[PDB]
Design a binder for this molecule. Structure first.
Ligand SMILES: Nc1ncnc2c1ncn2[C@@H]1O[C@H](CO)[C@@H](OP(=O)(O)O)[C@H]1O
Ligand SMILES: [Zn+2]
Lengths: 281, 602
């Protein structure tokens, strides 16, 4: 796995990254992966994450509710055999640092301090609104397109804005975690995941080859996924995704070894469906 | 029969409402949502009557009186009074079938308005399409979008079933400090721990709610793929009708105002005529400009000294700008609109208005969006539902009157568009009535003052933000978050207690400012003294600045004045939210900066 870090300067962000690289290979002759006239490329964009001066940050999980000067982590309750989330206040949005997200995934986070939750600074322009983001991280699995060696010959790429490029050949620690085994696992969607809840779960089952007795999806409102269809000269058909920050609480029949990360849903190659493994009590 | 508690939840609410270009779409969305709840509650009233619907209280609900009892009722029918959540008691054996009936009725109702909507759109040229290809408008792709847009979630629980008080609440995650005691007092009232759920009704409602939220996120992500093609100009999400058959330009040339509509937004544009032909009613103010122009009866003063002439010189430009001796577009009361939307026949209209502005004053260009929300056994719950039902149907309606447009009032929550000179007063009274209704119960609110050209979806989003992330984020809540979004893009926000409104209205400071650029530099210098903590201290700094900008007619009068302004400032400071005195001074003066803005309050 290669890690690409984009530093921007003046479709969703995931596809933008994916497409930015496809276009690069195209003009650079290596069209053997651009996937001309195809939805997905040959290589797979495992996922994308954003960053600020503090480094990589993630959407605050939806089961973490503000309660006075603290953001309390709310875990699953139970009623008549069904996994539920007890009522405890509206979800206020914001971001969290990778450090904090890790404690949360390990089940060691009870609450997060108010000044620890990050709010991304917007920026109007003429009308259009953008986020004052400092870095964009991209994880790519290259089956043999030589993306790493091509990117390492460029400092600047086009995302029509421009971005400085840095390609590190090493999978990030977030994807190398050792969660252990348990029946109470969770999956944090770090990128929009396209699919029906029931489908995602099945796939999850036939993928970790286990059975799921019960699950609870803590989310908000579907993310509308657009995109352009070059050959059709029209906009892609709208798809609705489970938004980043959503948590799939799962209760396995027989213990499972929780993978640090796992992809689910459609458009995997474009960066969608990146779920990060977690645990709960 | 066999007692069962049942909860109904309809979504999406705010996302649907926000998808509006015109105030009419906003009202329609809100109203339609209320109609959906009605279509759902009728399924229960047909089988059990209004006595088994705990919330909301249908008793005096206009929708219930006009559509169920068929009575003939006035314009009060135009206000949405039904929220998107409801609680009723049904036959446990009936539950599951009721969940199917309610889903089908809402689903059938929408498909119906859609079909009616498509006929209307063609028979009235909203969409200029061949007689033939009009049938493609009801193909499956479009029916899917209509059918799957809303998500009605119904969950229920047996009231008779017995369970261990503590074990049930602990497992649902409700063991608070309160709940722990409450339960105890319930075990005291009865030598037992294993009771029937209806014994812990309160906690039952909350569990039912959680059960309900689980249900919604399983049902709302089931949407189907959508055909590729150009999207709706109002919402940007769903496929625009015919959006898959034409290129972008050909598609827009087929719609009124060149704005391609998706199935939902079409129902949206059609909903007003439907309600009108079914009740003979329609909202008094159709656009935000209509509300904006209520400021100091500006509109009414213009129609009594320039109305006839304006309409006349309007035809001279084009017979289209008129209809029934009135202006077709309320925004034709502005100069700028003519210098944008027979060139020489226009130069006249402009100059006519320009002069008129010099005589009665420039036309109001800003309006206010007011949103309010409550802060924080069964039969007693019913009594509550009724006090709220009555407060929202009669009292709220009562204070708004005709000074603005009351769109929604589902109990302890409110949505209304008002002219800027009536916003603070209306909001305050509503809060006051709310307090009296319970002789306590706190209410928070957000008021966003915005220019008539600001996209409505964004204004609605900022108003919600003011409410949820400003006002409700204040410890102890019961706050009004006032936000002024100027056209230039400058955005001023101030968090105050409800009493600041009263104190400010009856103050000398208020009179003194409404007659002063003295007030403007007073506000600037003070704000500049509170960017950081003033070395000389808040109190001393205020006196210094007060002496600096406040003066009367003579040594004695100005001595009295400075003394009173300062005192009123300290009082006002009592009602400004903030973590310290500098934040309060800043907040109070930002508020003052807002209400003394000449463009907004000409
Ligand atoms: N028909 C409607 N029109 C306008 N506002 C409505 C409405 N129905 C409900 N609401 C309001 O939308 C808020 C967020 O969903 C709701 O608060 P809840 O969080 O659902 O209590 C209602 O106040
Ligand atoms: Zn639409």
């Amino acid at each position: 796995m290669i890690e690409v870090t984009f530093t921007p300067y003046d479709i969703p962000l995931p596809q933008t990254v994916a497409g930015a690289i496809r276009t690069l290979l195209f003009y650079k002759g290596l069209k053997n992966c651009v996937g001309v006239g195809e939805e997905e490329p040959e290589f797979t964009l495992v996922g994308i994450a954003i960053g600020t001066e503090k480094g990589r940050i993630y959407p605050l999980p939806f089961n973490i509710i503000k309660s006075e000067k603290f953001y309390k982590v709310v875990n699953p309750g139970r009623f008549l055999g069904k996994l539920i989330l007890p009522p405890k206040g509206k979800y206020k949005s914001g971001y969290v640092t990778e450090s904090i997200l890790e404690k949360y995934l390990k089940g060691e986070l009870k609450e997060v301090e108010e000044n620890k939750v990050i709010r991304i600074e917007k920026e109007k322009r003429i009308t259009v609104e953008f986020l004052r983001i400092e870095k964009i991280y991209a994880w790519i699995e290259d089956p043999g397109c030589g993306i790493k060696d091509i990117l390492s010959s460029y400092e600047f790429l086009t995302l029509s804005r421009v971005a400085f490029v840095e390609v590190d050949d090493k999978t990030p620690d977030i994807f190398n975690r050792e969660l252990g085994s348990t029946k109470k696992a969770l999956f944090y969607f770090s990128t929009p995941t396209i699919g029906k809840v029931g489908e995602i779960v099945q796939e999850l089952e036939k993928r970790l080859n286990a059975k799921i007795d019960d699950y609870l999806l803590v989310s908000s409102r579907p993310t509308a996924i657009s995109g352009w269809d070059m050959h059709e000269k029209k906009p892609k058909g709208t798809k609705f995704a489970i938004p980043p920050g959503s948590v799939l609480f799962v209760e396995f029949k027989e213990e499972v070894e929780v993978p640090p990360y796992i992809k689910l849903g459609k458009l995997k190659k474009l960066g969608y469906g990146l779920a990060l493994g977690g645990i709960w009590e | 029969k066999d007692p069962t508690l049942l909860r109904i939840k309809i979504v999406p609410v705010q996302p649907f409402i926000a998808n509006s270009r015109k105030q009419l779409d906003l009202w329609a969305s809100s109203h339609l949502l209320s109609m959906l709840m009605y279509k759902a509650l009728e399924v229960i009233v047909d089988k059990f009557g209004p006595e088994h619907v705990i919330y909301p209280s249908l008793r005096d609900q206009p929708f219930f009186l006009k559509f169920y009892l068929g009575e003939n009722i006035g314009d009060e029918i135009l206000v949405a009074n039904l929220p998107n959540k409801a609680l009723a008691i049904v036959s446990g054996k009936e539950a599951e079938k009721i969940e199917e009936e309610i889903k089908k009725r809402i689903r059938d109702f929408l498909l119906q308005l859609y079909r009616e909507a498509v006929d209307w759109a063609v028979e009235n040229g909203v969409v200029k399409v061949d007689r033939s290809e009009k049938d493609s408008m009801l193909k499956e792709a479009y029916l899917k979008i209509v059918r799957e847009y809303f998500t009605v979630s119904i969950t229920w629980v047996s009231l008779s079933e017995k369970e261990d008080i503590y074990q049930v609440t602990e497992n649902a995650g409700l063991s608070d400090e309160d709940v722990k005691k409450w339960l105890k007092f319930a075990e005291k009232k009865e030598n037992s721990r294993v009771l029937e759920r209806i014994a812990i009704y309160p906690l039952l409602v909350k569990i039912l709610d959680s059960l309900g939220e689980r249900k919604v996120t399983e049902e709302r992500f089931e949407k189907s793929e959508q055909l590729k093609g150009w999207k709706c100009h109002v919402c940007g999400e769903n496929l625009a009708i015919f959006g898959d058959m034409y290129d972008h330009d050909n598609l827009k040339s087929l719609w009124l105002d060149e704005e391609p509509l998706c199935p939902m937004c079409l129902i949206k544009r059609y909903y007003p005529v439907w309600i009108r032909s079914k009740t003979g009613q329609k909202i008094r103010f159709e656009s935000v400009v209509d509300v904006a122009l209520l400021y100091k009866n500006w509109r009414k003063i213009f129609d009594e000294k320039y109305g006839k002439d304006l309409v006349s010189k309007a035809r001279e430009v084009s017979e289209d700008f008129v209809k029934d001796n009135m202006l077709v577009d309320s925004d034709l009361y502005y100069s700028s609109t003519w210098e944008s939307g027979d060139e020489e026949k226009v130069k006249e209209v402009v100059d006519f208005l320009n002069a008129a502005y010099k005589e009665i004053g420039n036309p109001p260009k800003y309006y206010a969006i007011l949103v309010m929300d409550g802060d924080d056994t069964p039969q007693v719950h019913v009594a509550i539902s009724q006090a709220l039902a009555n407060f929202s149907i009669r009292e709220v309606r009562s204070v708004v009157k005709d000074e603005g447009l009351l769109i929604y009032a589902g109990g302890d929550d409110v949505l209304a568009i008002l002219p800027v000179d009536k916003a603070l007063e209306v909001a305050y009274k509503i809060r006051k009535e709310f307090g009296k209704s319970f002789e306590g119960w706190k209410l928070s609110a957000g008021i966003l003052i915005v220019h008539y050209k600001h996209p409505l979806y964004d204004a609605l989003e900022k108003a919600r933000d003011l409410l949820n992330n400003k006002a409700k984020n204040v410890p102890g809540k019961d706050t009004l978050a006032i936000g002024l979004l100027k056209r230039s893009g400058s955005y001023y926000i101030s968090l105050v207690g409800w009493e600041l409104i009263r104190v400010f209205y009856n103050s000398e400071l208020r009179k003194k400012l409404l007659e002063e650029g003295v007030g403007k530099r007073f506000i600037y210098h003070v704000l500049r003294e509170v960017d950081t903590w003033p070395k000389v201290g808040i109190d001393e700094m205020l006196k210094f600045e007060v002496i600096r900008h406040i003066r009367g007619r003579n040594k004695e009068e100005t001595k009295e004045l400075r003394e009173k302004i300062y005192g009123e400032i300290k009082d006002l400071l009592e009602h400004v939210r903030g973590n310290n005195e500098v934040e309060k001074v800043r907040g109070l003066f930002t508020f003052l900066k807002i209400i003394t803005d000449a463009e907004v309050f000409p």
